[PDB]
Amino acid sequence: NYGYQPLFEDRRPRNIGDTLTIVLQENVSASKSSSANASRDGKTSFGFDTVPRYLQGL
């Protein structure tokens, strides 16, 4: 004797020892990315190629 068994209810595990099918379908995909940058360029110049006479002391 197996006890009350339903007639229209789906066949589910109910007690200890009942078997159940597991469809293993795992798909995990995690990602991360990052970046940082900095730049700085400078040029300076001053040339008195021909100095006038009133400014040759400076």
Added chain:
Amino acid sequence: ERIRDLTSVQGVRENSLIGYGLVVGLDGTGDQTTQTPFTTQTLNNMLSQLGITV
């Protein structure tokens, strides 16, 4: 008969029960079963319980 027709006793009450079933023996006036999958699913469940695996 006034007190029984006017009052009710505490703890003397009716509950509601619900269930799902199948009705068979209809003269072609049942479900289409193409738009109600649960009818065929539960019929197959009943057959599987009774020993027929469709």
